[PDB]
Amino acid sequence: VLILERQGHDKDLQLHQSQLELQEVRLSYRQLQXXXXXXXXXXXXXXXX
Amino acid sequence: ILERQGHDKDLQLHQSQLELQEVRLSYRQLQXXXXXXXXXXXXXXXXXX
Hints:
The PDB classes it as motor protein. This is part of a larger assembly, with chains A and B. Chain A is built from one helix and no strands. By secondary structure, chain A is an all-alpha fold. Chain A is rod-shaped and about 70 Å long. Chain B is built from one helix and no strands. The longest helix of chain B has 47 residues, at 2-48. Classes of the chains: A mainly alpha, B mainly alpha. The interface between A and B is medium-sized, with 24 and 23 residues.
């Protein structure tokens, strides 16, 4: 169980790294969606024109 | 109880890995969509003109 607990803490570090990668990738896509929203604003202006 | 803690955290790890693969493929779709959005933004500026 000592070996299992040490592997469990290592896998908890894996949970930390995986959730950090997921949240950072989600923030990058939110910024890309913001860029897409800017593009949509441009498209809206184009539609008005 | 600690072995059950390790197993439940492993359950969270496998659920997160399934989400990593499926949502990663959708993220590659979003990458392509972001590229398309950038090109479409350029085309939207040209179309607004």
